[PDB]
Structure formats: structure tokens, C-alpha cells
Amino acid sequence: QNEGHECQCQCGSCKNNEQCQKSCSCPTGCNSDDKCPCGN
């Protein structure tokens, strides 16, 4: 909850909401735009 990694996500909810680019809860398999369990 208070730790993340690096959301270089270019998804549709990552490219718009950059408020999670420092705490996105996704594994190293978030390369698709329909498998992103991020903040949104």
C-alpha cells in the first residue's frame, strides 16, 4: 500500500492517471492494456 516500483505503464489508465506512477500495484507482466490491476 505504501510501496510500489516503476509504473512505466502506457496503458489507458496509466497514461492518464500518472498519480500512480510511483506506487502502481502491478507485477512485471503489465504489458497489456487489459490486464493492469493498477489503482484504476
Ligand SMILES: [Cu+]
Ligand atoms: Cu504502473
Ligand SMILES: [Cu+]
Ligand atoms: Cu497500466
Ligand SMILES: [Cu+]
Ligand atoms: Cu500507474
Ligand SMILES: [Cu+]
Ligand atoms: Cu500499476
Ligand SMILES: [Cu+]
Ligand atoms: Cu500496465
Ligand SMILES: [Cu+]
Ligand atoms: Cu498495471
Ligand SMILES: [Cu+]
Ligand atoms: Cu499502472
